[PDB]
Amino acid sequence: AHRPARVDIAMPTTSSPTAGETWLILGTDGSRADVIALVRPSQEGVTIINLPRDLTINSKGMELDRLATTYVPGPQNTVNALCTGLGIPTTHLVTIDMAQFATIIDSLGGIEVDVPEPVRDAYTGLNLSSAGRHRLSGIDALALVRSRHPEILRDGRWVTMSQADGAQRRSQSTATVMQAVLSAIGQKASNPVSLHQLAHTVAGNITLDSGTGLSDLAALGRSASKARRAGATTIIDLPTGPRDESIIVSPNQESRDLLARYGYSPKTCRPA
Ligand SMILES: [Co+2]
């Protein structure tokens, strides 16, 4: 029976030619966006741009908010903020909560993520006792991406690191998770019996905007499969300046160019 939850979103408008189909995937935590990624299907392949949650942008005409904070008054604010601040005109919207993320990952049979060293987090409940390939469950993967204050073993002691250190490990963990998700998706796309229940469960553990079709989601998956086989599937983190070299983490020239390549510019994007 599984049907996706629906949200009415007024999609932004653009004058840009290069900005084609752009999906906004939001990992949800009065709510905060823990994960913000833009999935770009094209004729070259598929590119995923992971937008750091702590990144501050121009949310509404002459006002600044962090990406994670834009989700609080609703997805409409995040969709609008990305447009006025980064120039990304959202074509489709996917929203996944904590329980939805853990269900989806456990429906994939978990994800294989390399752990460089034993990590723990009292807040998220993360405890990885050894380094190597780990096959993380839904709850483990969620604890890894949510890891606010990761404790690590230094000089025989559990030690916390800087806020920038933790945000860097988060973008890195989300990047690994995103790749592990993509890899597990294709590995489950080989078997026929799997897909039927898998595609059914995914639909029931997702929130979509009113204008995006369950069939539009199938086309994304179809263009992603074609891009996995062609070796044209790429995941990139938005190149922001040294995180511990400024109080506020703002988009730099590197970030603007990388976004300009894919046809995103604030000057050419308009909400409502
Ligand atoms: Co059902």
Author numbering: 78 to 106, 126 to 368
Tell me, in the authors' exact words, what the paper reports.
In the actinobacterium Actinomyces oris, an LCP homolog here named LcpA is genetically linked to GspA, a glycoprotein that is covalently attached to the bacterial peptidoglycan by the housekeeping sortase SrtA. Further biochemical characterizations provide evidence that LcpA possesses pyrophosphatase activity and also functions as a phosphotransferase, catalyzing glycosylation of the cell wall-anchored protein GspA. Altogether, the findings support that A. oris LcpA is an archetypal LCP enzyme that glycosylates a cell wall-anchored protein, a process that may be conserved in Actinobacteria, given the conservation of LcpA and GspA in these high-GC-content organisms.
The structure of the extracellular LCP domain (eLcpA, residues 78 to 370) was solved at 2.5-Å resolution. Electron density was observed for residues 79 to 106 and 126 to 368, which form a single domain that adopts an α-β-α architecture. A seven‐stranded antiparallel β‐sheet forms the core of the protein with a total of eight α‐helices flanking the β-sheet on both of its faces, forming a hydrophobic tunnel. The tunnel is ∼23 Å in length and is lined by residues located on the central β-sheet and helices H5, H6, and H7. Interestingly, during refinement additional electron density was observed near the exit point of the tunnel, defined by helices H6 and H7, indicating that a ligand was bound. The best match to the data was obtained by modeling the ligand as a PEG 4000 molecule that was used as a precipitant during crystallization. In A. oris LcpA, R128, R149, and R266 are conserved residues, which cluster together within a surface-exposed pocket (shown in red). Intriguingly, unlike other LCP enzymes, LcpA contains a disulfide bond, formed between residues C179 and C365, linking the C terminus to α-helix H2.
